[PDB]
Amino acid sequence: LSFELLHAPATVCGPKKSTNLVKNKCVNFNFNGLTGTGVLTESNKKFLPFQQFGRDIADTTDAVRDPQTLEILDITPCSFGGVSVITPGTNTSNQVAVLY
């Protein structure tokens, strides 16, 4: 058996059923075998219907087209970045603060 991960629409894989589309919550999505984490929103990107999915400067996933119903959805990561604290010396007090 021969397999290849070519840039082609997915045809043959498991019989696992799909679910209802959900928006405004960042989750893990399995769109035609593409694994990624992000929020699904309505996309303003409108192009000629001849390409499956697109990329960006970062060579990541930003545009998707599910084959069941042809609409374009937007992908962007949710909250990220480091977190720091605000505190004085521990000899005086322990009143600390959280900075985002």
């Binding site: 970062a58 990561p77 990220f80 970045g81 480091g82």
Partner: peptide
Amino acid sequence: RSPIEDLLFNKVTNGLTVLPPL
């Protein structure tokens, strides 16, 4: 702002983090 640095400001123009200056 004085107009000279106004003109100079107009002339001069994802896991990363860009901290703002102090």
